Amino acid sequence: KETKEVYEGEVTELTPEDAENPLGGYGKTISHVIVGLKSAKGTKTLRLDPTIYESIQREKVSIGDVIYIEANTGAVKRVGRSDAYATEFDLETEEYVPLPKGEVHKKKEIVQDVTLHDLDVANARPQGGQDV
């Protein structure tokens, strides 16, 4: 059993924030990234670090697309484009999903049970790493 907290919803406006101070450590970077999240019950603005924003840039997320951001692992997943925007184009490749229910933030725990041998097999073969 472990508890996870997730922010999910449609992205309203996301903006980077760059620091004018060079600091000597980097040539160019950002201090923080603010990304707004919209949901049926309510809307909330979040303040994120440049890394978890870099993940969003890897997901190629644009304004109006539902995203899934977990606090524990810090992973960002794009579910799909919002349903209301579907009528914009006649033909579209992207799938459409409704806006997530819930205010913004959610607290949930997972009671999943797993055998020890499955821990051994998952321990033998790693799923991690991007190496060729």
């Binding site: 184009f89 006649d90 033909l91 490749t93 992207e94 799938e95």
Partner: protein
Amino acid sequence: IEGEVVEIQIDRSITGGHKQGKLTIKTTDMETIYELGNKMIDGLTKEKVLAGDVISIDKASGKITKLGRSVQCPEGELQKRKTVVHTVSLHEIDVINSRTQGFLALFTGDTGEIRSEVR
């Protein structure tokens, strides 16, 4: 949505919009024009398409299927809702989950003792 394409126009990126294009899908019963969806334009420019061939574009799948040239005749209305039945054995379901690509393990016979937990 399937039908003959008489005219397809695709425009380079401009400041006004990312990409602007209009494809004309002609069928016997109805003929209408659709405005493409960006990545749709990347699918039409991705594989070379010549005007005057009969194709079938999949909205949910996002890929294009060419059924011939105009070899075939337009049957009717452009968009139709159909159901697709797929007959898959328990083995075929079992091999895909045990591997990254299991459908290759179906044909190649390299399956190699799938775990019983997966089954």
